[model samples]
Target chain A: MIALDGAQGEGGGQILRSALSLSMITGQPFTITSIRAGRAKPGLLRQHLTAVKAATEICGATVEGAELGSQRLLFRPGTVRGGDYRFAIGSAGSCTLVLQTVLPALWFADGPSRVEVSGGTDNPSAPPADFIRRVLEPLLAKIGIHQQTTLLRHGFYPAGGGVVATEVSPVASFNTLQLGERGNIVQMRGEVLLAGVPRHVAEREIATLAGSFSLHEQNIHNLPRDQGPGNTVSLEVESENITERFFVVGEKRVSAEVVAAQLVKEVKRYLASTAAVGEYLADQLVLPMALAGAGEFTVAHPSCHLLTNIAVVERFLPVRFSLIETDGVTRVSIE
Target chain B: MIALDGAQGEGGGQILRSALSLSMITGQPFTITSIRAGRAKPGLLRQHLTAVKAATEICGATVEGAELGSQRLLFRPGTVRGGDYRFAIGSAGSCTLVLQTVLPALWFADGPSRVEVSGGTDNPSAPPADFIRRVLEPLLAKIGIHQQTTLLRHGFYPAGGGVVATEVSPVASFNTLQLGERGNIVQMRGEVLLAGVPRHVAEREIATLAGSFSLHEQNIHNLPRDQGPGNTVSLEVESENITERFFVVGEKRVSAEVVAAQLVKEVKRYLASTAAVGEYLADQLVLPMALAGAGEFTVAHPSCHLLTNIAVVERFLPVRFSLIETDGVTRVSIE
Candidate 1:
């Protein structure tokens, strides 16, 4: 068994999520101690426990320390059998994170699979459902991992009624992806998603973006009142080579202008670099690219999460990552 | 008269300095109000007052509200006659800033000029002597402006004793500079300067850097005890297209490891970007580049200081700046 320390690198739930996927794929049994040890109130939370249960069900993996508040976990994987699956995180845990944890292992399943996960879809510190559906899935398809995601409902933190469904096809082969340049921007568009939030909030957010980019294409999306008391602003920059998405969720007491200004800053940071991928996307791309055996893409700053993920992937797979920097752009490649 | 609000842009002393240079160079008298109003202790500090004094002396300009606590001023230019000159900032005011305020106008003088200013040479919120010497002067030389700087003595905060001298030549013509890429790195060097600090502090600082970059060319410079109670760490990166410098001063309570770690992060941020110029250097370059009538370079981010300085320069010169971004790198140009 490969012994892993969950407290290593960024020392977050990412270590566990990544390890579960890698374990099921490589059939490498692993033991991890101090799960989320670096976090406040460290231990298995409801969201994490659900992920463990989902992983165990999908691969028939035997697991220890699967109970809530357990900090140590031993997971031994069996064959991953693809089929219909449903996992409900009983709290405002990120469903996208759970789906991400299982999606890769599904690529190695005997057949196609469909997963439905319901939890917080637009929460802090996690990629929203839209990010998976719009930003990540297309890139996955380019690397021969076909996964189609649909946001069935909008879920915000504390309310936790969001549902996301994904259809995954077993991978036949993988292709090396080269994304050295982002290429010319084809379009710049944005939207403010409002659910039971004030309309002026969405308008103010749009006005902020328009002032920054002189943005022309923008819309206000209002969902049914029952779906939310939530708000999110998203900017989509469709470049010739790739499309990048940025979003910010509104919070209570925060002005709409402040919310949209943060999003504007995010977009400006993206437009200020020559990287093919942003930081979060860069982290997610690594495992698939490593699985493809050989791939290279330019990224801005390499985040700790990306670096930690690379370490975990290397531990499970026979791949080494080379991060070569020229000027200020880093070319991340699997060697 | 051109009117300026010192409260504009970063709302720092930069507005006053830039306006001083432009007023002398363009022969346009200007009135500035609410000087440094954005700062907590709003109004003219010693450093800003020194800059006003130096500017007045350099061009024999008439000035009002030059007192230490004054928040408004009127400055009218006189003929800039270049020769040997000296000024002293009574406190730990940034002498380089005082020099920068008058250096550009010296380019229009009748002959070569030698200036000596004594104050804080290496201080917070200001560029150090080494930066102007190693990073910026070479680039200025490329644009057909020649200024040689020499640090006569080391100066830290509070005690206020530092001296810097510069030799400036009259400009007969101007040249446009284009720096799109930083090219390959030539050398990465670092140093820890110690004066009346523990030797372990310097060692720990260097040790932290070694852990980060495996830095090869590293040194420790010790000054005599008389230059006591000051510590600073500097990283010099000599790239093919440009040379960049980063530094941090040791604080009383902060550990040496913490001090060096911050500098390491800065160097890493620069290395991670493909821009030819760093933020502060980008801000400093705008005036010289604009005065050349045409120039352009790629920067990682367009700072508020750079934007504000550009605005001030445009008001004095017949120039317009165009900022174009491709991917994430921004191309800052004088059009």
Candidate 2:
């Protein structure tokens, strides 16, 4: 069993999440003494506990301490299971974060698996759903894994209620692929979803998007629901080798169409570029590729978050990443 | 004139933004070399240049080198002009970031001003719109500055065109306040917006939310739009002296309601305790409070980002922050 200290780097929850993901994938039982050591409370919160339980359940693992506010945890994996399972945070903890903890092992599991996560699908300090469904999944698929997602509800911070379901079809053999270039151009679609909010919000948002881009109305669509007032806009571009999703959220008194329009405009610019992915996606993709032992992809830029993630990935995987720049774009490859 | 090496502090865009905000607020002229030094390419991108231009326009400053891809810049402020001014970042650069750069000066300006910003509103690796509208604005209001924001549109990462207008009513003298305790909480509300997506997405999201909290349909509102298919949720809480906002964004197939509900739940937990403020908000509030020079606030925990901000704040202000832990709460005082 490896003992890991949680107070390292940014000191958010990424260290714990990364450890959980790597532990399950490596089948190495590890004891984390200080979960979220960098946080104010310096212990497990509801979402972190939920992630622990979820990871344990997915891997049929045994955990010594998994409770809210607990500072120490010992997780020992029994067997990695590849099947249909659902994990609910029961609070507004980041569902994507929970997914982050368990995805690596599941990606290399025996068969295809489907994961339904309920919690904050889109929360501050967490990866938005579009990044997972539109960007990460497509990029991962190129390495022989297929993943699909469905958004059940909209959850924000402090409310602790939201639901998102993801289905991961694992590959039989993970290939060592190189993704240095974004390849040829492809189709792009922009979408705006407005639920339980006023119509004018969407109108103004879309008007702003149309003003930015010369695209027709057919390129943008709106879905209105009677449930609760919520606003989100996303632009999805499908390239020959990968797909990227850009997202935006609307707030009180904010126009919905304007939100949609903004996403459309941003996606077009990324699509016009030669980089395989944006900066955030690049940060997320590095770990999985390093685990695969071979892959290359170009990114728009590098961030501290990316550098920090790279440091974390190095702690688990014995892979080296070389960053190469050519003509304003950055390429990261595992050597 | 002070010469600054922009290639400092993790070498991210935050340094540039912080430097710009401080320069405008202090009436100091400074030149920064090697902009975005740590980032790939290490030069001023379109967004950074636009921020420089926007700050220049608002303050009528003289800029020696302000151009896209320029690694060096010289900024000299003349006088801050308060009026209806508009700035547009043609790409998906963070609009909030630009707003952050100029907000300090505007908050302390002599007269009321209305500023419209067009660019990315919601992007990964940056604060979402909800954080600014819900948390930052209300806190500033308590300290004698009132700024209201209207989201004209939602802009996501890589999709740069979004619009948000802020009407700032600056107070002549900011009241020195202490947030040693969060005090009694009053009200909490969560809003989730799903635009241009499937109806089931909202259903599942809300279902998850309902499972977590005791909120009713009346407390939840749904926003409809015609231009987008985006997802986002935010939770807001009204305290005795402060109001906090937490946010989440939905991605592809991620339920909108779930995202909204999650934030609501998280905010409830935060309000349950007498924590001074959340981590991110704590970091953000420091600068303005330090500039005021007579206020103090206590936090539940201290984060690296908060510490880093304190270091940066010390560079621009003649204020000292004392961190004291008492009865499980961390208190920060400006001395």
Candidate 3:
């Protein structure tokens, strides 16, 4: 068994997440010591530990030290089994980050997998649920991985009770996909979700969004609930090959209209991007692309985080990424 | 006085932060009602309240409803004062973010300002000290605002108790700066700091960094007792125009070497960029640029956060930003 050191590049749970994802995809068993060893609290936070346990169940892997605050872990892969699994973070940790680690492996599993994750779905530290639903899922679908997600409840930090359910349909063989252009915009939706807040908040946000863009109230919707006090506005834009989600969280002494307008502006930029995906999505897609070993995508510009992720992937996989500029778009290809 | 409807745009704390920053910079006092009215726990958190208190103290502003969990607030600005001030969050709340909210005013103050803030320095949800020390300050210096920072203590999430001190020297007048090149590599220093942890942790981290980069052992030093039970690694690269700092927090199960390596990789890439500053720095520099009126600097690439900030600035200031590209370097000129 290979002993993987956890305190490597960008060492903040990503190393472990990527390792688990890649291990399942490549059919490798590895032991990682000093999990988050470089982090302040280290070990497994609520979300990370949940991810390890969930991945184990989904892939039928043997694992040890999958507890909160444990520093060392051994993950031995047996076979990838795609089935229904439910995991709870039991804290306001990021459920989406957990999903990110295991999604790629399930994409190549023998059957489909349905995952229900409960915990902070809209935590500020990680991408909120809207990101996965509007951005990741739609983009992954174009690349031949179909995923459906639903937000059962909104979860925030310090009091995470948010729940999210994901349905994944695996393909027999992953396709070699390329997204060189965003093309013309198809649809744009701006949503303001407020739980345990006033309904007028949504109206104010919607009005501001309308003022910022030439969109109608029909394109904007409000959902008010009693699921604790949380406020989030998301803007989603769908293009030919990808979709983008932009988010702004609510805080004290801030206006909802400001949030809505912010989301609208983000949506406008995504609609205008020459690349196929936004920056965050581009950074995230690197791992899955490396796993496929034969995919390509386009982004307006490369980010430091994206470059760092690429370097990390190069360490584990034999995939070569080529950057080509055509017209004005920067395209990245993996081979 | 303008009355800002609380239920507007991203309806959360961003509106408050932007308003506070803009208010102090522009000398405008605005009343905002329904502060986080859309959020569960709609009043101010400890950190937010602390920000208001600090802003008031620095600018000598008068504020109504600055209490914890208050939804509405009336703020009146006064003369900006530059001198030594200290603010304590008293919780794991982000001291950096509070400083971020007030930094614009400090940058444009009549004279130099020294600030000591105590609280969470490396919370996941907030921009950590590394961002301020590495990404934000260097770019500000290039733009004619000289700021120096020292991390006196390390604080993680839920523990609070981190300490950071900063000294800001404002220019008499702002000048539009442009960055077209990243210049040659100068020096690379990677230091791993450990407090209340084993000395071997730092040793292992130094060993890893040394092995990865084939560096001399003297370059890697262990800092103990600088804080509490904490682990952090920082990589700094001083360029002709700017210096970049990259950081990774240490955890119990993770190794010191892994953290050092992660930061090393990040710093190396930023050094590779042809721009005067990186993206994160660019995102931070926008607010100060808007406050100063005429500044030009080069950045890696524009981010959604930067774009959002630009939109916010345009709403208040009559300045225009022109994007210029020379080779692969992108520069933003404020006119």
Top candidate (DockQ): 3
Give lDDT: candidate 2, residue A125. 33
Model 3 alpha-carbon drift over 4 Å, by segment = A1-23, A27-54, A68-76, A81-106, A110-335, B1-19, B27-47, B60-65, B69-103, B110-141, B146-170, B188-236, B245-283, B290-335
Candidate 2 lDDT tens digits, B1-335: 66665654344466677777788888888777767553445588888888888888878898877877787888888677778878888756777877888777786666778888887776644577657776778778777778888887877554556788888876677878678666666665555565565666666665666565544342333444432446566655567767776766675544455465656666666766687688778878888888778787767655555655665576677877765544446667777
Q: DockQ of every model listed?
A: 0.03, 0.03, 0.04
- lDDT per residue for candidate 2 within A1-335, as digits (tens), equals 58776654454466678778888778778777877653446588888888888888888889987887777888888676899888888656778888778877787677778888876665533457657776777667767667787777766543446777888766666666666567775654555566565666656665666565544342434444432455666556566767676777765544465456546656765766688788678877877787778888887544445655766677667877755434445567776
**For each candidate, what is the lDDT?**
0.84, 0.69, 0.70
Q: What is the lDDT of residue A90 in candidate 3?
A: 68
Choose 2 or 3, whichever is better by DockQ: 3
Residues A119-196 of candidate 3: C-alpha lDDT, one tens digit per residue: 787654457877887677755665667789888777765467888888888754456767777776666566777777
What fnat does each of the candidate structures reach? 0.00, 0.04, 0.00
Tens digit per residue, CA lDDT, model 1, B143-254: 9999999888888765568888999998877889899888988887889888788789999998888887856588999987677588889888888988888999887778
Model 3 / residue A187 / CA error / Å:
10
The alpha-carbon lDDT assigned to residue A223 of candidate 2 equals 40
Looking at model 2, how many pairs of residues clash?
Answer: 112
